[PDB]
């Protein structure tokens, strides 16, 4: 079926297990920057 | 834009000076970012 156990498609999560907004230090989203800009 | 001023900018000395200044300008910019190209690098 092409590819194979050795050398198969690499699918990775860009999100890195954090939300779009309301995040901690490890994740600063673009919307978090909007929220940080509004509250300062 | 005026058609006679565009026909003036289409004259041979204006196009020659603009084209060779543009030509000189990208030779200058290419030798600015990538200087000392004595050879094709390979």
């Amino acid at each position: 079926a092409l590819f194979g156990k050795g050398s198969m498609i690499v699918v990775e999560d860009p999100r890195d297990g954090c939300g779009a907004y309301a995040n901690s230090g490890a994740c600063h989203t673009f919307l978090d920057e909007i929220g940080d800009a509004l509250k300062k | 834009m005026d058609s006679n001023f565009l026909k003036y900018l289409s004259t041979a000395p204006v196009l020659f000076t603009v084209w060779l200044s543009f030509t000189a300008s990208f030779i200058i910019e290419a030798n600015r970012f990538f200087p000392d190209m004595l050879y094709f690098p390979m």
């Binding site: 590819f3 050398s7 498609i9 690499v10 699918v11 990775e12 860009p14 600063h28 989203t29 673009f30 | -």
Partner: protein, 194 residues
């Protein structure tokens, strides 16, 4: 007789509302100088490449071909890491696609020499999805708009990859703002060089 896109300018000639996305936008009057057939061929070509390029940046963020040479999440690093033989293979294949799909009428003097030739119509419909005449107007409109959007989006993503050395999705998810200490624009002649 004013433009609908730019209401204070006159409606440009060679723009008559026949083409998809013909909203009357040509302030600089390039269509008065350059034949609208060539400009629509070039607009469709830029947009189609950009639609793949935008999808390329996002999909290369999510999925990779296997192997260490294809493991570059950030898209501008994939340019350097990907095997040169294969990237030049892509380039040569693109050149072959350009000569066959344009049918050796490639220049601005001989593309559209055939009166049957239509701007953007390279004969590309492998699954005959344009077999229905009714969808043709919507599809051509939605292709043009998707193309324009993807031109703007890919341009953004590249220049956001330059500013922030981060891939677009993980630049949105790990956003760090512009400090302005570095990435200053211009300045080659202000300091007189150096």
């Amino acid at each position: 007789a004013k433009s609908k896109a730019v209401p204070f300018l006159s409606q440009p000639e060679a723009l008559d509302g026949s083409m998809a996305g013909d909203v009357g936008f040509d302030p600089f009057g390039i269509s008065s100088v350059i034949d609208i057939k060539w400009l629509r061929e070039s607009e469709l070509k830029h947009g189609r490449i950009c639609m793949l390029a935008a999808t390329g940046c996002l999909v290369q963020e999510v999925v990779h071909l296997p192997g260490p040479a294809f493991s570059q999440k950030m898209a501008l690093n994939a340019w350097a890491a990907a095997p040169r033989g294969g990237m030049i293979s892509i380039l040569v294949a693109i050149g072959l696609i350009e000569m066959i799909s344009n049918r050796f009428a490639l220049t601005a003097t001989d593309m559209f020499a055939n009166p049957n030739r239509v701007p953007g119509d390279l004969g590309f419909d492998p699954l005959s999805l344009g077999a229905n005449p009714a969808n043709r107007a919507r599809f051509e409109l939605s292709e043009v708009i998707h193309g324009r959007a993807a031109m703007m989006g890919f341009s953004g993503m590249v220049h956001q990859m330059i500013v922030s050395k981060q891939a677009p999705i993980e630049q949105l998810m790990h956003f760090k703002a512009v400090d302005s200490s570095l990435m200053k624009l211009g300045g080659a002649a202000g300091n007189l060089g150096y």
